[PDB]
Amino acid sequence: ASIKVIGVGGGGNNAVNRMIENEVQGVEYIAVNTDAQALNLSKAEVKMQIGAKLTRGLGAGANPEVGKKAAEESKEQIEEALKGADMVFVTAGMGGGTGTGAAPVIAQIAKDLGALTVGVVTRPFTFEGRKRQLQAAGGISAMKEAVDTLIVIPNDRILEIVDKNTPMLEAFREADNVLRQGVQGISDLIATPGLINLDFADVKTIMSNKGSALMGIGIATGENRAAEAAKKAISSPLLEAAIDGAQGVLMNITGGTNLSLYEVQEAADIVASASDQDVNMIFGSVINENLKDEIVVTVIATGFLENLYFQ
């Protein structure tokens, strides 16, 4: 019901701006940062500088311990901002100071206020280096303890989706779009008009597994678009483990006014077929009138036990 999306650090702030630009419905936005200049580029109504005394508005120096202390020092302000939320999406890039350190604090605060708490985070590109990778892993570990479900987006896999000539700036931009998709894929089903909506209880079920979660996105146009987009979503490089490993599955199929119930069910069947016979699966559909013939299928698959996929 009351849904808040809280963007923590640069990548999270970008995901929040993308949602606002795209007029995503039914949610309140909160932008959090230690970097006051980055925060002043936010489009969010609620802009929350944390660590003012500690960081002086200059960011966390890529130190997760500073992001953490900043969040701890602004605990009261965060609690007030999230008060009464039924669901909170805590969205952040991992590997820096602010996202890595503050997001897990914010997540535990959201849990403590009684919110269904969903983390949506990116693992940094390998090109960012080993220190970024290691810090990110620390953050992902803390986030996993602090949320109900943690959706982890591997940025390296984005480089498998986009053109090989994609510039680095656009690669980051695409990462932040995938973050936005991880949030909107779920929130739209609860908040926005479609052929099939889900209530909080429905979502709440699959979003309360242990392990971690992954997402896949598929886009298609043309007569066989529903089957094609559904297969693309489950075959997505973002979905690093096959969906038959998942304990729960949510499917969102979004399209224009020419998307039919038959297409929704056909896509759902394909996803169900690739899943465990005992999966808990839910699905919905929403209409975006700016789509003509394009449809977008987002699968969120939860309950992957990390130990099963250890290299």
Next chain:
Amino acid sequence: ASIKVIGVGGGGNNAVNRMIENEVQGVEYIAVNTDAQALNLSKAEVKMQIGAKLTRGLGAGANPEVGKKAAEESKEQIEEALKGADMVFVTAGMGGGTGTGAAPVIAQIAKDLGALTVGVVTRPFTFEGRKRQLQAAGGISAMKEAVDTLIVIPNDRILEIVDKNTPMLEAFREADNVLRQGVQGISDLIATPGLINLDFADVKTIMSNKGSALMGIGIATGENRAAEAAKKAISSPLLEAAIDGAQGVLMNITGGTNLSLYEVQEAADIVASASDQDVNMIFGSVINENLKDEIVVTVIATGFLENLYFQ
């Protein structure tokens, strides 16, 4: 000081028997099973049938939920057996009913009595099938929540170490020997006479990280045996992640009376060199007079964040 090794199910019971056969010092042995016939093959002084009413001595039917309930029903008996332990090694194969379900209960009991609680478990061979793999992953997940450190031994990697003509029976036997090595590698350093012993506090440090732990074993003979065994241990297929990912490292070098302090330090240097500059590393050495020219180096590396190594 008071060290207990508790073998839970068939694989754990085998590891316990191997230690007893090899006269491992300084530890008390407890064998646990739901299968009364398997338990009557134990050499352990304390033999603990669990789930007598529930399973009638016939085992858990490969159902982890039955192993769990059996352990829960014998909680009092387990608490009495472990009472006062300073350290408890909970050793089990994962993927069956008894090991998978009972070991995590036993581990949390050991934690609740104030023991430093180390899990040493095997992941089943792939040839055992998908159901075994999935059950095992569930168990590893529960064990990780219930111990201070969880050492995970991938049985498939044993097939990379042994002869390609090794029969299946001997493959299982080798798995259970690696389990024993995971326990004795640590316990011998606290309990058994050597060039260099470690006290509880020393171990306790590296055994209290988060994430999971891995082990590597190296064996060599001849003039350059110490350097060779140390390099073999850190290059071991059992050590599925490179040791520079670890937060803590223990090295045990064991040999006959011809093993020198120089050799111990040389091996320790090689291990330290391959580790993170900021690793917490400890090492010791013990003498086994039945070794002539052979030495054995065991590395236990703790604090691997599982998310970092997700496929």
